[PDB]
Amino acid sequence: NKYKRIFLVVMDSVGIGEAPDAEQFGDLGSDTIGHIAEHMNGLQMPNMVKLGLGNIREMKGISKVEKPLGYYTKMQEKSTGKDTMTGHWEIMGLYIDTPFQVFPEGFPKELLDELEEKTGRKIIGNKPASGTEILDELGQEQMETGSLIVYTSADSVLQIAAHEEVVPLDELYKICKIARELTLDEKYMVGRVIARPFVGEPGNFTRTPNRHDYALKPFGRTVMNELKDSDYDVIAIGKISDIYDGEGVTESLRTKSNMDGMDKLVDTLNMDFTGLSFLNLVDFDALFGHRRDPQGYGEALQEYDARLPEVFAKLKEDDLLLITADHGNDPIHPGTDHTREYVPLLAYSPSMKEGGQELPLRQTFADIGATVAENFGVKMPEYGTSFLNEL
Ligand SMILES: [Mn+2]
Ligand SMILES: [Mn+2]
Ligand SMILES: [Mn+2]
């Protein structure tokens, strides 16, 4: 193998400007990093800059360097959707025609009608809400009626809340499995059905650790599957395992924050493995992009950047670091959805003694999967063109 270990970091939602097909999505003008940089009066990301972020695109506080540490370019999404699952599935070598849906005005009556028809239970709520908001509003009604609180977030999810002392956990799980079947329908296609059991009393409801997720498997066998099948390590950090529903994963490390994600990345650098370590930094999307909070987003990017020099120090000659994103989520954009954007790609190994160069623009995110597959000599994905030889 050219590289013994590849460290792949997805800065979730960290887009680098509207894609050629942004108009289709109502995403004209979208620019995640650029708008944040403007809000911050210049972003402080000296390490990403050293890698060549400004060489991809110059933005406020983010300038090009003469000798970037590694190779750089951006990637264009080929799949139809701009959601997390589509982006990640494409990165690992797939092409996804059918987009996952979001529901800012709640779910269509037709879906909720069938769920009622199959479960024998009434549905209340049917809107985007945090767990706390929806429970304060409807928790008491739920307890008194045995109805199901159905709600969503800004992402492609269908969440079902029920009090553990009113709806048995096992019954809630059965209901979520029914909802999971009904939502395998392109009209209602949600990435994830989530059981949200809760306990307590009016004015004091708490969601329990008995949350269960019902995800769809990737629409194809991914480069991760092939790595696992060839006895390579595939270490998933953060939301990665969930995003792929465990497919191709050999070890999964849960994280609770971006900083914790970087700590686990550091943990994997200290591990003797051969294969892939794959981190998702989710705070960018979950805490800042969807909440349209450019200040919080900017601070998070600066916090992430400050962690990088330790990563640089731990990389070996036969390690490769890949940093990218899965879509945009411009925190100064209308609405709460993601934005259709190019994503940055930075590829760095300490063995690049003379620094890196510009790569041709990646015409699909699957170019990452193809590169990983070629490196480890496993079956090449159907989509994607490897840039391994360019490095
Ligand atoms: Mn938009
Ligand atoms: Mn995402
Ligand atoms: Mn999102």
UniProtKB/Swiss-Prot annotation:
Positions with a binding annotation for Mn(2+) 1: D12, D326, H327
Cofactor section: Mn(2+)
Gene Ontology MF, one: magnesium ion binding
Alphabetized Pfam families for the sequence: Metalloenzyme (PF01676)
Residues noted as binding Mn(2+) 2 in the record, renumbered to the chain: D285, H290, H338
This enzyme's EC code(s): 5.4.2.7
Entry-linked PANTHER family: PHOSPHOPENTOMUTASE
Taxonomy of the source species: Bacteria, Bacillati, Bacillota, Bacilli, Bacillales
Xref: Gene3D superfamilies: Alkaline Phosphatase, subunit A (3.40.720.10), Phosphopentomutase (3.30.70.1250)
The name this protein goes by in its record: Phosphopentomutase
Name of the gene this protein is made from: deoB
GO biological process: 2-deoxyribose 1-phosphate catabolic process; 5-phosphoribose 1-diphosphate biosynthetic process; metabolic compound salvage; nucleotide metabolic process
Cofactor note: Binds 2 manganese ions.
